[PDB]
Design an enzyme around this catalytic site. Structure first.
Site, PDB file in Angstrom:
ATOM      1  N   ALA A 174       2.021   3.039  -6.448  1.00  0.00           N
ATOM      2  CA  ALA A 174       1.555   4.637  -7.308  1.00  0.00           C
ATOM      3  C   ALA A 174       2.523   4.813  -8.565  1.00  0.00           C
ATOM      4  CB  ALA A 174       1.917   5.751  -6.318  1.00  0.00           C
ATOM      5  N   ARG A 234       1.168   0.592  12.497  1.00  0.00           N
ATOM      6  CA  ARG A 234       1.714   1.462  12.136  1.00  0.00           C
ATOM      7  C   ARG A 234       1.936   2.668  13.234  1.00  0.00           C
ATOM      8  NH1 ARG A 234       0.193   3.544   6.353  1.00  0.00           N
ATOM      9  NH2 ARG A 234       2.609   3.812   6.396  1.00  0.00           N
ATOM     10  N   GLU A 265     -14.402  14.207  -7.567  1.00  0.00           N
ATOM     11  CA  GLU A 265     -13.637  13.490  -6.336  1.00  0.00           C
ATOM     12  C   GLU A 265     -14.867  13.383  -5.139  1.00  0.00           C
ATOM     13  OE1 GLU A 265     -11.052  11.883  -4.648  1.00  0.00           O
ATOM     14  OE2 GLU A 265     -12.551  11.982  -2.983  1.00  0.00           O
ATOM     15  N   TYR A 285      11.906   3.503   8.906  1.00  0.00           N
ATOM     16  CA  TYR A 285      12.568   4.558   8.287  1.00  0.00           C
ATOM     17  C   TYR A 285      12.708   5.730   8.867  1.00  0.00           C
ATOM     18  CZ  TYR A 285       7.958   4.792   5.893  1.00  0.00           C
ATOM     19  OH  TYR A 285       6.696   5.063   5.660  1.00  0.00           O
ATOM     20  N   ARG A 333       2.290  12.779   1.139  1.00  0.00           N
ATOM     21  CA  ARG A 333       1.351  12.488   0.340  1.00  0.00           C
ATOM     22  C   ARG A 333       0.394  13.612   0.332  1.00  0.00           C
ATOM     23  NH1 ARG A 333       0.143   6.658  -0.161  1.00  0.00           N
ATOM     24  NH2 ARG A 333      -1.638   7.555  -1.514  1.00  0.00           N
ATOM     25  N   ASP A 380      -4.954   2.487  -8.800  1.00  0.00           N
ATOM     26  CA  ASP A 380      -5.367   1.310  -8.008  1.00  0.00           C
ATOM     27  C   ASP A 380      -6.939   0.813  -8.506  1.00  0.00           C
ATOM     28  OD1 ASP A 380      -3.152   1.538  -6.466  1.00  0.00           O
ATOM     29  OD2 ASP A 380      -4.406   1.964  -4.600  1.00  0.00           O
ATOM     30  N   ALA A 414       7.188   7.098  -1.441  1.00  0.00           N
ATOM     31  CA  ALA A 414       8.548   7.330  -2.257  1.00  0.00           C
ATOM     32  C   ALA A 414       8.166   6.789  -3.656  1.00  0.00           C
ATOM     33  CB  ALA A 414       9.742   6.673  -1.529  1.00  0.00           C
TER      34      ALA A 414
HETATM   35  C1  LIG Z   1       0.606   1.568   3.501  1.00  0.00           C
HETATM   36  C2  LIG Z   1       1.041   2.120   1.899  1.00  0.00           C
HETATM   37  C3  LIG Z   1       2.145   2.416   1.669  1.00  0.00           C
HETATM   38  C4  LIG Z   1       1.945   2.768   0.330  1.00  0.00           C
HETATM   39  N1  LIG Z   1       3.436   3.320   0.014  1.00  0.00           N
HETATM   40  C5  LIG Z   1       4.020   3.536  -1.357  1.00  0.00           C
HETATM   41  C6  LIG Z   1       5.053   4.280  -1.835  1.00  0.00           C
HETATM   42  O1  LIG Z   1       6.054   4.481  -1.060  1.00  0.00           O
HETATM   43  N2  LIG Z   1       5.379   4.645  -3.382  1.00  0.00           N
HETATM   44  C7  LIG Z   1       4.277   4.317  -4.357  1.00  0.00           C
HETATM   45  O2  LIG Z   1       4.666   4.439  -5.317  1.00  0.00           O
HETATM   46  N3  LIG Z   1       2.901   3.658  -3.931  1.00  0.00           N
HETATM   47  C8  LIG Z   1       2.692   3.478  -2.361  1.00  0.00           C
HETATM   48  N4  LIG Z   1       1.644   2.864  -1.996  1.00  0.00           N
HETATM   49  C9  LIG Z   1       0.535   2.813  -3.211  1.00  0.00           C
HETATM   50  C10 LIG Z   1      -0.148   4.005  -3.315  1.00  0.00           C
HETATM   51  O3  LIG Z   1      -0.421   4.593  -2.176  1.00  0.00           O
HETATM   52  C11 LIG Z   1      -1.451   3.841  -4.105  1.00  0.00           C
HETATM   53  O4  LIG Z   1      -0.925   3.214  -5.401  1.00  0.00           O
HETATM   54  C12 LIG Z   1      -1.833   5.259  -4.739  1.00  0.00           C
HETATM   55  O5  LIG Z   1      -2.623   5.988  -3.753  1.00  0.00           O
HETATM   56  C13 LIG Z   1      -2.855   4.795  -5.678  1.00  0.00           C
HETATM   57  O6  LIG Z   1      -3.653   6.171  -6.086  1.00  0.00           O
HETATM   58  P1  LIG Z   1      -4.935   6.114  -6.672  1.00  0.00           P
HETATM   59  O7  LIG Z   1      -5.186   7.770  -7.411  1.00  0.00           O
HETATM   60  O8  LIG Z   1      -5.153   5.285  -7.881  1.00  0.00           O
HETATM   61  O9  LIG Z   1      -6.161   5.865  -5.833  1.00  0.00           O
HETATM   62  P2  LIG Z   1      -6.277   6.586  -4.360  1.00  0.00           P
HETATM   63  O10 LIG Z   1      -4.954   7.240  -3.690  1.00  0.00           O
HETATM   64  O11 LIG Z   1      -7.229   5.528  -3.721  1.00  0.00           O
HETATM   65  O12 LIG Z   1      -7.286   7.863  -4.973  1.00  0.00           O
HETATM   66  C14 LIG Z   1      -8.590   7.429  -5.274  1.00  0.00           C
HETATM   67  C15 LIG Z   1      -9.677   8.659  -5.118  1.00  0.00           C
HETATM   68  O13 LIG Z   1     -10.640   8.211  -5.735  1.00  0.00           O
HETATM   69  C16 LIG Z   1     -11.901   8.783  -4.867  1.00  0.00           C
HETATM   70  N5  LIG Z   1     -13.291   7.955  -5.243  1.00  0.00           N
HETATM   71  C17 LIG Z   1     -13.404   6.627  -4.702  1.00  0.00           C
HETATM   72  N6  LIG Z   1     -14.517   6.329  -5.223  1.00  0.00           N
HETATM   73  C18 LIG Z   1     -15.062   7.364  -5.795  1.00  0.00           C
HETATM   74  C19 LIG Z   1     -16.143   7.669  -6.393  1.00  0.00           C
HETATM   75  N7  LIG Z   1     -17.444   6.670  -6.487  1.00  0.00           N
HETATM   76  N8  LIG Z   1     -16.590   8.829  -7.030  1.00  0.00           N
HETATM   77  C20 LIG Z   1     -15.357   9.744  -6.911  1.00  0.00           C
HETATM   78  N9  LIG Z   1     -14.441   9.616  -6.290  1.00  0.00           N
HETATM   79  C21 LIG Z   1     -14.354   8.476  -5.660  1.00  0.00           C
HETATM   80  C22 LIG Z   1     -11.266   8.525  -3.587  1.00  0.00           C
HETATM   81  O14 LIG Z   1     -12.121   9.458  -2.620  1.00  0.00           O
HETATM   82  C23 LIG Z   1     -10.049   8.936  -3.789  1.00  0.00           C
HETATM   83  O15 LIG Z   1      -9.638  10.466  -3.442  1.00  0.00           O
HETATM   84  C24 LIG Z   1       1.294   2.647  -0.589  1.00  0.00           C
HETATM   85  C25 LIG Z   1       0.048   2.102  -0.315  1.00  0.00           C
HETATM   86  C26 LIG Z   1      -0.370   1.648   1.091  1.00  0.00           C
HETATM   87  C27 LIG Z   1      -1.419   1.129   1.475  1.00  0.00           C
END
Ligand SMILES: Cc1cc2nc3c(=O)[nH]c(=O)nc-3n(C[C@H](O)[C@H](O)[C@H](O)COP(=O)(O)OP(=O)(O)OC[C@H]3O[C@@H](n4cnc5c(N)ncnc54)[C@H](O)[C@@H]3O)c2cc1C
Ligand SMILES: Cc1cc2nc3c(=O)[nH]c(=O)nc-3n(C[C@H](O)[C@H](O)[C@H](O)COP(=O)(O)OP(=O)(O)OC[C@H]3O[C@@H](n4cnc5c(N)ncnc54)[C@H](O)[C@@H]3O)c2cc1C
Ligand SMILES: [Cl-]
Ligand SMILES: [Cl-]
Lengths: 431, 430
Positions: free
Chosen positions: B318, B189, B32, B222, B107, B305, B44
């Site tokens: 997510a 927000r 990380e 909400y 979160r 993502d 959620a």
């Molecule tokens: C406003 C908003 C509301 C949302 N509400 C929901 C919900 O209610 N339910 C749901 O299912 N989804 C929701 N989502 C979608 C959800 O937040 C994301 O899909 C989820 O966070 C994706 O997680 P992830 O682990 O793939 O990526 P991230 O949460 O982006 O985690 C990625 C990690 O990788 C690290 N990273 C980045 N680059 C590097 C690098 N070169 N080297 C090492 N580490 C790195 C980052 O620092 C970070 O910690 C919402 C999104 C938004 C914007």
């Protein structure tokens, strides 16, 4: 407001149930009468279905399984094979493909030890033999009294205490025949032979695979062990007499005693018995067939595994049925846990009894069917007609029934069971 | 030896994936970039994703439920749509998701609880991936970090989010496929008190989740903090580009938000007037314009993502990532058991075969979901919501929203796993 479960019995089902419950945040104690491990060196095998059920309880259970067992080319498929043991034709009669990893085998005691290592420290308390259960009001804890004079108090009790369950005796009355298993009028001789001797008697193909030899009023199963260096023999015979009350269910026997039950059988099979050690073991086969449980649960008490539905071993899957029980109970109690968060003591304890009622409603038919089916397939293995050459075609038609019963075991829809259990729980709660 | 996995990224998907892999005996490291984290917002999960978490490791669901508040009969979860543009404020549509059809958490609390579930020594912070060095299939993959240190792993999973570096390695830093792009919408927000929410909206709306539809914008609120506060997210349209390296989150004023809704009905204008003077503006980027041509290549795989970032209008991004984690975990556990006592050539071929099956079974649903997330937003923001004579056309959108919602919520993850295992075995030459 945390939910506590007292599991009586630290065998394979009790420990697997404990692992599932603790991984979900439920407070568990396992009370085991023994000082340590038993069934040293025995093997057992689980269907692929049971292995998926284990994974759903806690994936670490499957890691423990695969740490407790056994070159390129392809992945081996698992076959069951039947052979004619009576006649000299000695001809292959049937086989069933269970697929890649259709069964996964381990050493029982090594698997149980690895499972205890998966649990947090202190979950299992040994030298704790349940003596008496004291039930008060549903809103009160259940008290367990052990032979050593100590007590424990838990929100609910699961009897995973095996074929001679003390929890079962509590439920039905220690004088009821329903509280006790009974003799199936068959017993088994068990012993090993070297793989070298096994090949002499049967040929390389049979010596290196699992085969059941059918015939009149008896049957024999063998399969390799210790890295294909030896072959394990189990020879089941009919016993018209009673097994005397208090005569031990395991005792010593001689090679020659076993040989006599198979004197009219074909020579390869007789040779196998001849190659066993002079001294072997005799195992009586008891089960819950004659007096099946009227219910698996009452109030805040529930039976699982052999405590609920001990079977004779002719399907090789009795523990698999218990793992289904453990999955069902675990999913139910976790639903009690989440659905009653914040509610009153009265509601939480009503929810326990509602969940245990659902467990009984959803499991008892399949479990008791399985006990019946284990006796039935043994009867088919042992048809007197196997010897009557005028009836070898009616006899050989048993195999479609064996297939259908095996598939009903192996292809169990556990996701539908869990769905039905949650819906019955919610219904029992007035929803 | 065992199989080792280097997960780049310690967000929710990377840590959930680690939990699933380590519980099956696979050797995992999580790298990380941040020091050590997440934001205070709530999120959620669908009942379906929660079942997927349980299959990864039941302790994940324990962590979820212990990271979210405590609620006589059991409440069903509803999604509700309201007309935001006419004082009518009429209730337009509702979908019933059942008992715990969604489960919510904070979160930051969920991620901390999850890291506690992992064994010590898995998550390595201040490890910002800079370059990947791949060699022969049979050699380890080398990760190079910004602090000049290195790691060597049998395979790499990019769980590194919307601006994934693993994705840039696969497609090239100058390819548009390596980067997210702007959806030409951004969100305001903020929070108001429940007392103020009741005053603007009435008690029934104030205490439930509602989406207010209207022309070229929409608003969702909400209750949060055990019904003492109400969270507001107000999405508006932006014809301009987002400057490339301008930050995606920034400060804004309540008056700026109020201007976008000046023609909307009064209750909703009041909600915005009750926010703090200073609030946040969030730009919405995604992978819609340039979706990945593949999620995997050799012994490198994207999840979450990093693979398929979406704009948030289904509230399930997510969830799609958790499906990814489950699929990758089940595949790599099958690599592990099926190649146990084979040569390094076979084990490494099996990793590539597993990552190829991942791409084959996941890409269509995940890229469909990114497109769906933009589409439902277009429906929530139809220009025709402004015109009372076009109301039948505008309200007709809800059958498509129901279809899309159900496709997300009713996912057959067991068939997906069976298909993944079958494609893995086919890829291995059987
Ligand atoms: C406003 C908003 C509301 C949302 N509400 C929901 C919900 O209610 N339910 C749901 O299912 N989804 C929701 N989502 C979608 C959800 O937040 C994301 O899909 C989820 O966070 C994706 O997680 P992830 O682990 O793939 O990526 P991230 O949460 O982006 O985690 C990625 C990690 O990788 C690290 N990273 C980045 N680059 C590097 C690098 N070169 N080297 C090492 N580490 C790195 C980052 O620092 C970070 O910690 C919402 C999104 C938004 C914007
Ligand atoms: C020869 C044979 C071969 C078999 N092979 C297979 C196979 O290959 N695959 C399969 O699925 N099944 C097989 N089975 C069936 C399987 O072994 C059982 O179904 C399984 O052991 C049941 O597990 P359990 O935990 O319910 O009971 P048990 O294994 O009997 O454990 C019960 C525990 O409770 C303890 N206990 C008893 N009373 C008390 C008390 N009052 N207080 C505290 N503790 C108590 C006991 O000491 C024991 O440790 C076989 C059975 C036999 C006989
Ligand atoms: Cl059995
Ligand atoms: Cl989202």
């Amino acid at each position: 407001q945390p939910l506590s479960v007292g599991i009586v019995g630290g065998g394979i089902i009790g420990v697997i149930l404990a692992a599932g419950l603790v991984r979900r945040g439920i407070d568990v104690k396992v009370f085991e009468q023994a000082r340590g491990f038993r069934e040293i060196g025995a093997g057992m095998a689980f269907t692929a279905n049971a292995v998926r059920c284990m994974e759903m309880l806690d994936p670490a259970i499957v890691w423990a399984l695969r740490s407790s067992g056994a070159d390129h080319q392809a992945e081996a498929r698992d076959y069951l094979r039947w052979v004619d043991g009576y006649h000299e034709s000695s001809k292959r009669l049937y086989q069933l493909d269970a697929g890649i990893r259709g069964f996964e085998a381990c050493r029982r005691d090594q698997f149980l030890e690895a499972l205890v290592k998966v649990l947090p420290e202190g979950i299992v308390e040994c030298q704790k033999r349940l003596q008496k259960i004291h039930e008060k009001n549903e809103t009160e804890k259940v008290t367990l009294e052990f032979a050593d004079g100590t007590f424990a108090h838990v929100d609910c009790v699961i009897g995973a205490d095996g074929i001679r369950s003390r929890v079962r005796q509590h439920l039905f009355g220690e004088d009821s025949p329903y509280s006790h298993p009974h003799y199936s009028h068959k017993f088994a001789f068990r012993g090993l032979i070297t793989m070298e001797n096994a090949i002499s008697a049967l040929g390389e193909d049979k010596a290196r695979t699992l085969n059941m030899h059918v015939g009149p009023n008896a049957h024999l199963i063998h399969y390799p062990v210790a890295n294909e260096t030896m072959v394990n023999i189990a020879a089941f015979v009919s016993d018209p007499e009673e097994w005397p009350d208090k005569l031990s269910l395991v005792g010593p026997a001689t090679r020659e005693e076993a040989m006599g039950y198979f004197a009219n059988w074909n020579p390869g099979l007789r040779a196998v018995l001849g190659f066993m050690p002079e001294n072997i073991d005799r195992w009586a086969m008891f089960d819950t067939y004659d007096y099946p449980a009227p219910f698996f649960s009452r109030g805040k008490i529930c039976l699982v595994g052999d405590a609920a539905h001990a079977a004779v071993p002719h399907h090789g899957a009795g523990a698999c049925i218990g793992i289904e029980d453990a999955l069902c109970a675990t999913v139910l109690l976790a639903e009690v846990f989440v659905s009653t968060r914040g509610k009153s003591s009265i509601v939480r304890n009503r929810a326990i009894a509602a969940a245990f009622g659902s467990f009984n409603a959803v499991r008892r038919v399949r479990a008791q069917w399985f006990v019946d089916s284990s006796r039935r397939v043994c009867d088919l293995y042992q048809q007197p007609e196997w010897a009557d050459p005028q009836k070898r075609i009616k006899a050989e038609n048993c195999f479609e029934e064996i297939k259908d019963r095996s598939h009903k075991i192996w292809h169990f829809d556990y996701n539908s069971m869990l769905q039905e259990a949650i819906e019955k729980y919610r219904h029992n709660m007035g929803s």
